[PDB]
Amino acid sequence: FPPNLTRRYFLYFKPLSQNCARRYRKKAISSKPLSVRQIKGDFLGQLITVRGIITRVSDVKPAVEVIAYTCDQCGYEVFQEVNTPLSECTSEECSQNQTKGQLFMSTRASKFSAFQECKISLNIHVNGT
Amino acid sequence: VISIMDQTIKDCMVSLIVDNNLDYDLDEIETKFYKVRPYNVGSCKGMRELNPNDIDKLINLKGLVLRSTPVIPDMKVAFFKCNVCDHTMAVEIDRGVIQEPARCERIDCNEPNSMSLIHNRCSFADKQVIKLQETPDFVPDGQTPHSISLCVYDELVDSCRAGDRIEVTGTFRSIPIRANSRQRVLKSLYKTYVDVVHVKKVHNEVEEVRQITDQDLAKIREVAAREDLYSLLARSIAPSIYELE
């Protein structure tokens, strides 16, 4: 079983406040509300703060994470994480019997998470609660 | 659960024939596949409260019909025919998979890659797409009402026109989308669609309704018995505007 299938909680990271950032004198950029034009090439993968106006709010679309394929012959659930659907079964029962069963995607066995697109322009993807 | 109700309703039909002892054809009744159409549930969640954990769940929807699309044929039983010995076959489609035969079933033929698929001799099914709009009574102030796709099958097609208030209480399924029309890749987003099971307007007809409460009907008749009904309803319709009786 994949670890993402059992994780039912959405971990978040709250930035530091203006009171705790004054005593810490070691790169206090994550606590300052930066703009969109100030985002250079060195801020990739960093926890920054973007201040603006949210425009074009999309709907709540369920996004899958782990797709489980239920076979018809052996009946095994092949989990695949999403960061191409699997058609051939990778179980040992379908390889020893020389009978490659068709993998059927089970919607009930797949975990789906929330996904919403927002524009501040800069695209903002909201996931979770 | 619906698949179980379709089988329990078949055994109950046979028990009613033996208990009545009628001279009817038992083979014509057992071969008919009966379907159950549940509706009017308690989970009346809107289009905005569609949580991702409600995959394949019957949720009642109370919206309005926007447009109407023509009937699209859906293949159910494929038809194959050989090109040498002319051997007609009938292979059913299971879970949207058309298992084509590799070799011919005839002993005199037995030629690989010799079966031709004839789409004109296949049993198609009715499929209609109905665009449902959200009810403005439930949409909060400052937001735009969205839409959703509905799938109508069986003989329930051609029953919902534009500008009609219906009640769709069907399952909430989802189908994946492809990133390219020539490749077999799939995107991360899944197209959500509600499979229509029963159509209750707000074919067949409603036999009765069970709105409001019978306890409120006693209070309704209490005000109707009073002689000051024309003056009490005139003041409650606008208590912020003086005069204008």
Curated annotation (Swiss-Prot), chain A:
The chain holds residues 192 to 338 of 845 of the full protein. Present with 166 molecules/cell in log phase SD medium. Early fractionation of eukaryotic MCM proteins yielded a variety of dimeric, trimeric and tetrameric complexes with unclear biological significance. Specifically a MCM467 subcomplex is shown to have in vitro helicase activity which is inhibited by the MCM2 subunit. The MCM2-7 hexamer is the proposed physiological active complex. This is DNA replication licensing factor MCM7. Component of the MCM2-7 complex. The complex forms a toroidal hexameric ring with the proposed subunit order MCM2-MCM6-MCM4-MCM7-MCM3-MCM5; loaded onto DNA, forms a head-head double hexamer. Interacts with CSM1 and MCM10. Belongs to the MCM family. The lineage of its organism: Eukaryota, Fungi, Dikarya, Ascomycota, Saccharomycotina. Acts as a component of the MCM2-7 complex (MCM complex) which is the putative replicative helicase essential for 'once per cell cycle' DNA replication initiation and elongation in eukaryotic cells. Core component of CDC45-MCM-GINS (CMG) helicase, the molecular machine that unwinds template DNA during replication, and around which the replisome is built. It is found in: Cytoplasm; Nucleus.
